[PDB]
Symmetry: D2
Subunit: 116 residues, 4 copies
Amino acid sequence: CPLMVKVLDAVRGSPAINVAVHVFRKAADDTWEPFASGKTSESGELHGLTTEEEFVEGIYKVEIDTKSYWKALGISPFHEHAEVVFTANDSGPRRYTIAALLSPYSYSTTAVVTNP
Amino acid sequence: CPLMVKVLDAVRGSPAINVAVHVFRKAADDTWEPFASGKTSESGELHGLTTEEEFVEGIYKVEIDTKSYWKALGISPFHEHAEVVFTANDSGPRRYTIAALLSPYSYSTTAVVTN
Amino acid sequence: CPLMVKVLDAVRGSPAINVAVHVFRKAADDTWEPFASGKTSESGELHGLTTEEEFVEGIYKVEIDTKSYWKALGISPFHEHAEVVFTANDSGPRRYTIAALLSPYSYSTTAVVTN
Amino acid sequence: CPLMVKVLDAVRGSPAINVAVHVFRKAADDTWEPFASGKTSESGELHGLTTEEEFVEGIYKVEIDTKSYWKALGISPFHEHAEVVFTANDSGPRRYTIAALLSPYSYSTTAVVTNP
Ligand SMILES: COc1cc(O)c2c(=O)cc(-c3ccc(O)c(O)c3)oc2c1
Ligand SMILES: COc1cc(O)c2c(=O)cc(-c3ccc(O)c(O)c3)oc2c1
Ligand code: NA
Ligand code: NA
């Protein structure tokens, strides 16, 4: 898979398990079209969102459902979600790992991009 | 003003100057309505976006134009922009500072909410 | 003052108040010599640590007592402290702000160096 | 191995390769004794620093040689190194991953702690 999402919990020092993730792709009319979705596993990772064939050039938005995550742990957090927006595959196919590190009032996100 | 945005550059160890910032309010039909905008100052800060009277409870989005910032420095970045989406809540402290720390392939954002 | 320390709490979205901070200078024999210290204020800031005359070039270490901060809030943390080690350089801009953003199992630190 | 170090480069969007790491353990006299060292691989990971038997309770310091890393890439960075200091194994053996995300004037570090 050319798109993977990894989420960590900075309060617990653990993977962030059962985090919902929705991916969108900007359409020709400039709307955000639903592209793929899933949830993180016990390891904090979400694999299998898409395929090399389907993951064409485009502008993609990875929404990480942080508020839904934190509230289930009894924490009222600040953000609604984390949104990671990027152009993909503009120089040919790449593999993308989107990582996020979550706290109730803060998050950081990183991308690791590799050429297969 | 109840909303301030502060932007820092983790590559040069400096405020991120002249960065465009757009704030939107979520409307009843779920679209994003322009609310306020500006450019960060020489200190990386953008003050005066709104007033107590206008900044009612609701969902807001702060978009920070990170891509143009990095391109003006000759650096190829990953993200189109950084987006910070949150609910304004009258029960909490009254002053919101949205801080962002920028790198070409990463950013971190924080909310400092005080009285 | 050429050196300021700012500490933020990523769990509560607030300044980190009453955090002990110790600054050390590296001596010729490689040991760490106490240099300045204090506690962060209600704004999470510690001003007045040193002066231009005393803050000569060299290697400095800023230790932030994060463990005591989290324990006073009833939260079990990972780190003993956060340590920031850097060289002061007269060629660069003259004012150093060392910022730290704290979580129980993580921290991030940044240097904002300006004139 | 119960101690692993992972390092990422926030400028390049890549693993941070060939980063030197020195681990110390506080001795009874309160000095920092050299405990293990190594360097990150092509994946940004450093495995095999220690063993379950040798990684006893203690206060450990993981020094990540960030300045040496960045200068080789033609970047004069701010910090000398990142130092991650923590008590380990105080409630019995655990597995620790120390992760760091590096920029020239900033870094963030996280721990993921698991119970085997
Ligand atoms: C199990 O421990 C791991 C494993 C990873 O793959 C990762 C990873 O891929 C990325 C990061 C990370 C660390 C600090 C940040 O501020 C950030 O945005 C990301 O942590 C990990 C920790
Ligand atoms: C001038 O120095 C300052 C001043 C500030 O108010 C701030 C501030 O409000 C927040 C942060 C900050 C630091 C690290 C992060 O990972 C992050 O997301 C934010 O840095 C500052 C630095
Ligand atoms: Na192209
Ligand atoms: Na014990």
